[model samples]
Target: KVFGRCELAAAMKRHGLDNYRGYSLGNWVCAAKFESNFNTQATNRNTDGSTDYGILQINSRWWCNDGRTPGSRNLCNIPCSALLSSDITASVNCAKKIVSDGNGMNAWVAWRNRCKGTDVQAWIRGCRL
Candidate 1:
């Protein structure tokens, strides 16, 4: 599903991302907006043979096994397709894993470009929760 702004916000909060790793909900909302526009099926292939999957664009190289990537570690231990699902459970799990692995939100280029070092409240401005 291509989640609405507040819909995705609520989902992220439900998954406990509101203040994960010092990044607030607004940062996440802004990141998601620029990363995949809250689209579950979003994907982008890198020049290094790895692909980013789902709304958070979890990477195939260090996260999921897309089969096309040559040396996928698949740290998430799940199929890349799961990230594309509307359920978003696997997506959030893998995202947590990515952070737990110590990379922080810096792993996402969009977050760095569009969300980092700034007040992101505008992204979640109209959301009620």
Candidate 2:
């Protein structure tokens, strides 16, 4: 449980559930299970040197990070993108702010589609919030 509570709080914040925020913990768990297995540093390889990073599996190309192969960096940095103010979730508080505005939910749909693949209802099961 070392990272469970922290991750849960992050998931809840990312999904836009604050105060009475209880709509996205399930979604976070599902996404985490499917994406990075809830590991923040998760990385996948690309032939050209680009890599996918973080729990969301966000790509280097999208976030404008230097995730190059041999001649560049070791692994892609999720922070380069996710940390951008432009990104929905840089930190827990930042993500909560984005979700609070009611626009971050689109990200939730996108993630769910990738992991659940059209089964958007996965969060309803065992989703305490």
Candidate 3:
């Protein structure tokens, strides 16, 4: 649905907090709740002039793979939008892997800081990978 309350809760449950690897389920849920309220379709054109996309508002270049653009076929199949759009479990699993890899989600704190206590915005920016 269009972004609103309860989106984060649904994402957490569907993403499997306990089964997640990198961050705690509770922490992940908090991040998601803070970031985008779990809106899978959420998107933004940043003030600094960047394109952010999906429930996580993940940058396309970082998340996109296999020669797929955000709007292209198989782009969402990566980890940014497809997981939320089609399978939360896959999305969360991909996120956990990236985080554990240490190359992802490292700047999540900064992202969270920008939102600064807004549950939905924080969730959108909190998860780095």
Cα lDDT of model 2 by residue, 1-129, tens digit: 123534454555555654423434554555545655555656675566666555545545434365453344322233444533323354344334334555443444445466434553454454344
Give Cα-based local distance difference scores for all models: 0.88, 0.47, 0.49
Q: Can you give the lDDT of residue 37 in candidate 3? A: 62
Q: Please give the TM-score that candidate 1 achieves against the real structure.
A: 0.95
Write one digit per residue (lDDT tens) for candidate 1, span 1-129: 999999998999999888887778898888888889999999998899798989898889988888888866999999999999988889988888787667689888999887898889887788878
Candidate ordering by lDDT (highest first): 1, 3, 2
TM-score of 3: 0.53
Best by lDDT: 1
Off by over 4 Å in 2: 5-10, 14-28, 67-114, 117-128
Worst-scoring 10-residue span by lDDT in model 3: 120-129
CA RMSD of all predictions: 1.1, 7.5, 7.2
- The TM-score-based order of candidates, best leading, equals 1, 3, 2
The alpha-carbon lDDT assigned to residue 24 of candidate 2 equals 46
- Taking the tens digit of each residue's C-alpha lDDT, what string does model 3 give over 38-126? 66666665554444555555555454443344443333346344544633555565555546655445435533564334453333344
